[PDB]
Design a protein around this motif. Structure first.
Motif, mmCIF file in Angstrom:
data_model
loop_
_atom_site.group_PDB
_atom_site.id
_atom_site.type_symbol
_atom_site.label_atom_id
_atom_site.label_comp_id
_atom_site.label_asym_id
_atom_site.label_seq_id
_atom_site.Cartn_x
_atom_site.Cartn_y
_atom_site.Cartn_z
ATOM 1 N N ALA A 191 -32.396 61.113 2.114
ATOM 2 C CA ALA A 191 -32.015 60.141 3.133
ATOM 3 C C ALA A 191 -31.650 60.826 4.445
ATOM 4 O O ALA A 191 -32.027 60.355 5.519
ATOM 5 C CB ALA A 191 -30.853 59.283 2.631
ATOM 6 N N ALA A 192 -30.920 61.942 4.381
ATOM 7 C CA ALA A 192 -30.496 62.627 5.606
ATOM 8 C C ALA A 192 -31.696 63.161 6.380
ATOM 9 O O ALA A 192 -31.674 63.225 7.621
ATOM 10 C CB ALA A 192 -29.543 63.771 5.253
ATOM 11 N N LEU A 193 -32.765 63.485 5.665
ATOM 12 C CA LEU A 193 -33.965 64.053 6.255
ATOM 13 C C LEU A 193 -34.852 63.000 6.899
ATOM 14 O O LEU A 193 -35.693 63.343 7.736
ATOM 15 C CB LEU A 193 -34.739 64.783 5.164
ATOM 16 N N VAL B 87 -21.477 68.218 4.164
ATOM 17 C CA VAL B 87 -22.432 69.094 4.849
ATOM 18 C C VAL B 87 -23.487 68.265 5.573
ATOM 19 O O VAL B 87 -23.828 68.534 6.729
ATOM 20 C CB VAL B 87 -23.078 70.070 3.848
ATOM 21 N N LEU B 88 -24.043 67.261 4.896
ATOM 22 C CA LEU B 88 -25.026 66.398 5.549
ATOM 23 C C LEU B 88 -24.446 65.722 6.794
ATOM 24 O O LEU B 88 -25.126 65.614 7.824
ATOM 25 C CB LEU B 88 -25.546 65.347 4.568
ATOM 26 N N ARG B 89 -23.183 65.291 6.731
ATOM 27 C CA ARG B 89 -22.551 64.691 7.903
ATOM 28 C C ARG B 89 -22.452 65.693 9.056
ATOM 29 O O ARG B 89 -22.710 65.343 10.216
ATOM 30 C CB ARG B 89 -21.170 64.147 7.532
ATOM 31 N N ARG B 90 -22.093 66.948 8.756
ATOM 32 C CA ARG B 90 -22.053 68.000 9.777
ATOM 33 C C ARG B 90 -23.422 68.256 10.409
ATOM 34 O O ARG B 90 -23.504 68.734 11.553
ATOM 35 C CB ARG B 90 -21.532 69.308 9.169
ATOM 36 N N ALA C 229 -26.179 63.439 9.797
ATOM 37 C CA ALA C 229 -26.425 62.227 9.027
ATOM 38 C C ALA C 229 -25.212 61.312 9.118
ATOM 39 O O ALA C 229 -24.091 61.764 9.363
ATOM 40 C CB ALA C 229 -26.725 62.571 7.563
ATOM 41 N N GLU C 230 -25.442 60.004 8.941
ATOM 42 C CA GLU C 230 -24.354 59.029 8.847
ATOM 43 C C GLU C 230 -23.923 58.955 7.384
ATOM 44 O O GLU C 230 -24.703 58.542 6.519
ATOM 45 C CB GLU C 230 -24.801 57.659 9.363
ATOM 46 N N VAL C 231 -22.705 59.414 7.097
ATOM 47 C CA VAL C 231 -22.210 59.501 5.731
ATOM 48 C C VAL C 231 -20.963 58.650 5.605
ATOM 49 O O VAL C 231 -19.968 58.891 6.302
ATOM 50 C CB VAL C 231 -21.899 60.946 5.327
ATOM 51 N N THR D 212 -22.718 56.103 0.856
ATOM 52 C CA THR D 212 -23.977 55.820 1.533
ATOM 53 C C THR D 212 -24.299 56.945 2.510
ATOM 54 O O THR D 212 -23.437 57.340 3.300
ATOM 55 C CB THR D 212 -23.898 54.483 2.289
ATOM 56 N N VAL D 213 -25.535 57.462 2.459
ATOM 57 C CA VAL D 213 -26.030 58.427 3.440
ATOM 58 C C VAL D 213 -27.203 57.790 4.173
ATOM 59 O O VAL D 213 -28.084 57.205 3.543
ATOM 60 C CB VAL D 213 -26.445 59.749 2.771
#
Ligand SMILES: [K+]
Length: 400
Positions: free
Chosen positions: A226-228, A253-256, A259-261, A269-270
């Motif tokens: 999702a982050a990608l 990490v994805l939020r950094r 991504a919207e986490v 939800t990501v």
């Protein structure tokens, strides 16, 4: 719908059996091991009711109902260790056996500790192995010294046994232990640790409704996809703010990276934003997800440097080297050091991934294949080590 955690389901089944009252387990993992556990409980005289979503267990604070039983543990390691432990705290004569293949997996630290604690347990063949017979008359409690500096299930079995003993336990001897203690707290028992001794009180457990978390390591691949993907959203119900599994921290990490986490009370939800920013990440305490990050780093805005991951080198394959080797085969520049890997984003070209039989190498580079056509694996079946249906679930994510 991602599968429940195997190790959390195992502990929860023990607690549901042993507590005072009717416990409801929500979304437990259904595997051959947990099915055999449930079957063994029914053979021992516990009432077990099941739906596709929840299992219901009438707890027995004094152990199995029947006075005598032959219990077959099938191929399940949890069943083979936890059921004799539950029975040892009860009162009766219980003959355990396992499949010819599972007989080959001994449990000597656990059976030595139970006999140190006064249990009449007898191995019918070699010491440590099934078949074994427990002539149970409860467990008094007190001190015990466990020599399990390897497998984590033996300490956890003794911790879980503690409140069933008459006087409590003082067990003289890791993320696995903190999960066991938190689950015992959800069932009404506080454990204290003093130096090398876990101090577990008597008095039993309190039944509750207990939701089993989906495997958070398995969830990392779906969160990463999702982050990608700009505008894509993945929600995993059951992974929330109070989650026991440290690998949920992968989403921070994805939020950094942009991504919207959203980590809610009962779900996470990501959402991909199109922004995937490079960074340095210390992944010491979430290291099973180091490959998940390595596999999306080719698309970042700047180098992705993963630090403090010496532990990834000493798995059954060196996962640091395996990530570097496969990223380089795709055309990506990679540097490595003793305990770090630095990935330099750029165009990637499809190739066959060398898995080394490692489920996390296959699952991680599957995410890369969302954006890089022509990725295949030399060993796609090794995902079955933790998620037999992974390729089906990921195909479904791809179509959505
Ligand atoms: K003894």
């Amino acid at each position: 719908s991602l599968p429940g955690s195997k190790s959390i389901t195992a502990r929860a089944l023990f607690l549901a059996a042993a507590a005072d009252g009717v416990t409801t387990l929500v979304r437990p993992l259904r595997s051959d091991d947990t099915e055999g556990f449930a079957e063994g409980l029914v053979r021992l005289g516990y009432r077990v009711g099941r739906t596709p979503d929840t299992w219901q267990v009438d707890g027995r604070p004094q152990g199995p109902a029947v006075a005598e039983a032959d219990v077959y543990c099938r191929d399940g390691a949890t069943t083979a260790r936890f059921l004799p432990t539950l029975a040892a705290a009860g009162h009766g004569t219980y003959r355990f056996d396992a499949s010819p293949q599972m007989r080959r997996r001994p449990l000597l630290p656990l059976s030595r500790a139970l006999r140190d604690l006064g249990v009449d347990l007898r191995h019918e063949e070699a010491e440590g192995h099934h078949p074994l017979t427990v002539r149970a008359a409860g467990v008094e409690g007190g001190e015990v010294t466990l020599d399990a500096g390897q497998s984590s299930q033996y300490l956890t079995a003794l911790l879980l046994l503690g409140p069933l003993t008459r006087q409590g336990l003082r067990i003289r001897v890791a993320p696995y232990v903190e999960i066991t203690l938190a689950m015992m707290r959800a069932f009404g028992v506080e454990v204290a640790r003093e130096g090398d001794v876990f101090v577990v009180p008597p008095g039993g457990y309190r039944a509750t409704t207990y939701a089993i978390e989906p495997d958070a390591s398995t969830a990392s691949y779906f969160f990463a996809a999702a982050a990608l993907t700009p505008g894509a959203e993945v929600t995993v119900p059951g992974l929330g703010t109070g989650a026991l599994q440290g690998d949920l921290g992968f989403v921070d990490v994805l939020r950094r990276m942009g991504a919207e986490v959203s980590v809610g009370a009962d779900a996470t939800t990501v959402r991909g934003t199109g922004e995937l920013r490079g960074l340095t990440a210390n992944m010491r305490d979430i290291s099973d997800t180091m490959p998940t990050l390595a596999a999306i780093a080719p698309f970042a805005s700047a180098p992705v440097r993963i630090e403090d991951v010496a532990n990834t080198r000493v798995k059954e394959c060196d996962r640091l080297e395996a990530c570097a080797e496969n990223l380089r085969r795709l055309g990506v520049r990679v540097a490595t050091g003793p305990d770090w890997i630095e990935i330099h984003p750029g165009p990637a070209t499809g190739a066959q991934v060398t898995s080394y039989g490692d489920h996390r190498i296959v699952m991680s580079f599957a995410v890369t294949g969302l954006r890089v056509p022509g990725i295949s694996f030399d060993d796609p079946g090794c995902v079955r080590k933790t998620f037999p249906g992974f390729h089906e679930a990921f195909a479904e994510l791809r179509r959505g």
